[PDB]
Amino acid sequence: NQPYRTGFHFQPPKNWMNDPNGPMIYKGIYHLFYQWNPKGAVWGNIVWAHSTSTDLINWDPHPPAIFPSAPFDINGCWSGSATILPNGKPVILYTGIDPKNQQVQNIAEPKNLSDPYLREWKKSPLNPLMAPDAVNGINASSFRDPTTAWLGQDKKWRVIIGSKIHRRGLAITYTSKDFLKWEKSPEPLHYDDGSGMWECPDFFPVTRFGSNGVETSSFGEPNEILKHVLKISLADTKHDYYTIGTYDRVKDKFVPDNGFKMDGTAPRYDYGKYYASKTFFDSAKNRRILWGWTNESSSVEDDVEKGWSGIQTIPRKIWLDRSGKQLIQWPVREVERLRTKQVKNLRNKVLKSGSRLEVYGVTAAQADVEVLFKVRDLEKADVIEPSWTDPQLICSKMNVSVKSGLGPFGLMVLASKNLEEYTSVYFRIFKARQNSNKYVVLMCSDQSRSSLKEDNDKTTYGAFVDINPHQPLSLRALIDHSVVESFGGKGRACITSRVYPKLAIGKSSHLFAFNYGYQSVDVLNLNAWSMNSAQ
Numbered sequence: 001n002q003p004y005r006t007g008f009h010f011q012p013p014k015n016w017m018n019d020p021n022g023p024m025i026y027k028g029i030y031h032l033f034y035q036w037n038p039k040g041a042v043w044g045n046i047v048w049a050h051s052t053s054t055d056l057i058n059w060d061p062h063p064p065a066i067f068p069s070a071p072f073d074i075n076g077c078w079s080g081s082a083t084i085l086p087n088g089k090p091v092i093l094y095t096g097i098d099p100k101n102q103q104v105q106n107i108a109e110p111k112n113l114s115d116p117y118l119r120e121w122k123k124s125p126l127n128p129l130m131a132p133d134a135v136n137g138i139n140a141s142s143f144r145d146p147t148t149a150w151l152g153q154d155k156k157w158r159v160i161i162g163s164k165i166h167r168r169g170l171a172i173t174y175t176s177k178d179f180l181k182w183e184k185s186p187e188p189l190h191y192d193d194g195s196g197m198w199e200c201p202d203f204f205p206v207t208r209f210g211s212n213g214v215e216t217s218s219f220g221e222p223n224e225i226l227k228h229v230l231k232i233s234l235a236d237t238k239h240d241y242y243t244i245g246t247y248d249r250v251k252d253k254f255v256p257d258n259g260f261k262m263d264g265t266a267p268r269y270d271y272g273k274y275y276a277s278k279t280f281f282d283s284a285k286n287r288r289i290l291w292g293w294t295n296e297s298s299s300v301e302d303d304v305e306k307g308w309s310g311i312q313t314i315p316r317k318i319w320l321d322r323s324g325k326q327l328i329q330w331p332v333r334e335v336e337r338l339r340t341k342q343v344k345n346l347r348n349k350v351l352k353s354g355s356r357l358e359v360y361g362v363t364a365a366q367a368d369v370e371v372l373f374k375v376r377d378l379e380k381a382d383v384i385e386p387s388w389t390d391p392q393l394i395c396s397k398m399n400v401s402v403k404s405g406l407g408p409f410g411l412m413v414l415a416s417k418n419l420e421e422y423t424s425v426y427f428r429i430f431k432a433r434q435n436s437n438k439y440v441v442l443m444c445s446d447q448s449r450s451s452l453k454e455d456n457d458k459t460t461y462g463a464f465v466d467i468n469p470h471q472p473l474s475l476r477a478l479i480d481h482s483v484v485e486s487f488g489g490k491g492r493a494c495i496t497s498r499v500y501p502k503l504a505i506g507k508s509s510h511l512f513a514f515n516y517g518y519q520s521v522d523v524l525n526l527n528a529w530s531m532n533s534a535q
């Protein structure tokens, strides 16, 4: 019996899953590889597992693609990325562990380029293409995760590798004119002092105005103003951060926009349980897709007990916000195909102070729900306390029991009949400590009351949303048994959490809208779809 296995998120039939690997589209087929343990529910014996799709939702298995079978990767096949060469040919750059336990960079390419599912991959010699040594002095124990490579205006390829030198994180950048002979640049594309190791780095352009994706090597088209994103997975904090800036192709550096620092004080893709993010360019739809690894919030005991660990968020479409300050994400449209044609709809319903509204007629552990909340009188929101800068510390300081002028209001997902178990995703609104009348919208994902099992990770997640509370506040949540993916302000803030209820399972879960704030807020619209299982 498996109450926590997802009905429609990507996870292997069994065992431990980890980083998403070399995602790509080839011959109109979507590919996903991933770090897999073929014989355990913990990390180990790590190989590139492999599934394919035509819609990014239903995945067909294939035997592992990249596994230890040569000096350059004999002690493991760590993370990496697929580049698609200008002639449509796809290649994987991945980190392998050698006889000396050194992290080195290997190329792998398909052996049958006419196989539409690219089942078997051949590797060099002359692998490794990139390795630490005495001359470059790269930390052999911290040199992993090559990105998708991009082609410069000087016919030379660039690729970065996450690394660190003495508690300074950097994107070690290599150049190559043939994709076979790679040479280290004197200086990295970017670095941050005091940040740890830089894992799973990503580097890609975005249009300044538009929802569409940009091919990874593009400079034009003239005219069209581009912006560049550098994303890192910060090993110490265990979060993925990105910064928006410009790519000086002359110096071959990355320059973060004024109002950013790549270490710590940066925006996250996701303010909950989300790690080792990776994007690819979906040439089929001209969109950039972001893959993300949500690991397990239960005990390791539980993981080995259920015999699997780790899921993948449903893929996000990602693009720049109009104001240029952050990225927007939104679950790929395809996932909406999983919705039943029946749809529970509630409109213009008032939530008085301290109220809640059950929403029936849905499979409440496997569902998609979208709400529009309208605030009646913004002059009623409490002025935000002076030293409240961390949105995670606000949500954890004040639970749904503590009441604000406006908020807490939102959804209670994965909830038991009598509410002993519930996961609350919600908003609070404040007036800011500014001379201009600006409001601060808080999004929380509180899971302290989430499950009766006590040794689950009940960490509460939190985020600010850049939306105007004059217009109605939008909240979506994908609910899938042991995962909720909350989206605030139409993708302006995303929180993934992991939840393991003992009561709120299958038949026995709701599903509430609620409001415990001082002022009564209006539910403008509520759509709830039951969700069919994938694959």
Ligand SMILES: *[C@@H]1O[C@H](CO)[C@@H](O[C@@H]2O[C@H](CO)[C@@H](O[C@@H]3O[C@H](CO[C@H]4O[C@H](CO)[C@@H](O)[C@H](O)[C@@H]4O)[C@@H](O)[C@H](O[C@H]4O[C@H](CO)[C@@H](O)[C@H](O)[C@@H]4O[C@H]4O[C@H](CO)[C@@H](O)[C@H](O)[C@@H]4O)[C@@H]3O)[C@H](O)[C@H]2NC(C)=O)[C@H](O)[C@H]1NC(C)=O
Binding pocket: 238, 273, 274, 275, 294, 295, 296, 297, 298, 392, 393, 396, 397, 457, 458, 459, 460
């Ligand atoms: C893969 O999966 C695992 C598990 O899900 C995950 O590790 C967990 O990460 C979370 C954070 O994401 C950790 O949550 C913290 O837990 C500590 C306590 O943990 C200790 O004790 C437990 C045993 O019960 C052990 O598991 C663990 O090893 C530790 O010894 C909390 O204290 C933290 O809460 C504080 O900080 C939060 C903000 O970050 C606030 O929300 C909260 O209010 C707390 O602040 C309080 O103390 C502050 C002083 O430090 C003070 O400023 C405040 O006033 C306040 O009182 C936090 O909940 C969790 O412990 C991890 N668990 C394990 C098993 O390691 C991995 O990260 C994940 N990996 C990936 C790649 O995603």
Ligand SMILES: *[C@@H]1O[C@H](CO)[C@@H](O[C@@H]2O[C@H](CO)[C@@H](O)[C@H](O)[C@H]2NC(C)=O)[C@H](O)[C@H]1NC(C)=O
Binding pocket: 139, 140, 141, 142, 164, 165, 166, 167
């Ligand atoms: C090279 O990287 C390795 C691995 O991160 C470093 O050795 C680790 O340092 C940490 C933190 O001080 C300690 O837990 C251990 O001493 C090592 N742990 C691991 C995970 O191996 C080493 O310090 C780095 N050296 C340089 C020159 O950057």
Ligand SMILES: OC[C@H]1O[C@@](CO)(O[C@H]2O[C@H](CO)[C@@H](O)[C@H](O)[C@H]2O)[C@@H](O)[C@@H]1O
Binding pocket: 018, 019, 035, 043, 046, 078, 079, 080, 095, 144, 145, 199, 200, 235, 276
């Ligand atoms: O599977 C290895 C792959 O995962 C990452 C990030 O998730 O590193 C994790 O696994 C390593 C193997 O034990 C650890 O050294 C590291 O601390 C952990 O975050 C990638 O860096 C790596 O390619």
Ligand SMILES: *[C@@H]1O[C@H](CO)[C@@H](O)[C@H](O)[C@H]1NC(C)=O
Binding pocket: 112, 113, 114, 115, 116
């Ligand atoms: C490669 O793919 C083609 C087309 O699917 C297939 O017919 C062929 O047998 C495969 N292998 C070789 C060695 O050509």
Ligand code: NA
Binding pocket: 287, 317, 331, 332, 333, 334
């Ligand atoms: Na889409």
Ligand SMILES: [Zn+2]
Binding pocket: 166
């Ligand atoms: Zn040194």
Ligand SMILES: [Zn+2]
Binding pocket: 237, 239
């Ligand atoms: Zn943190």
Ligand SMILES: [Zn+2]
Binding pocket: 190, 191, 192, 256, 261, 262, 263
């Ligand atoms: Zn920086």
Ligand SMILES: [Zn+2]
Binding pocket: 378, 470
């Ligand atoms: Zn006003």
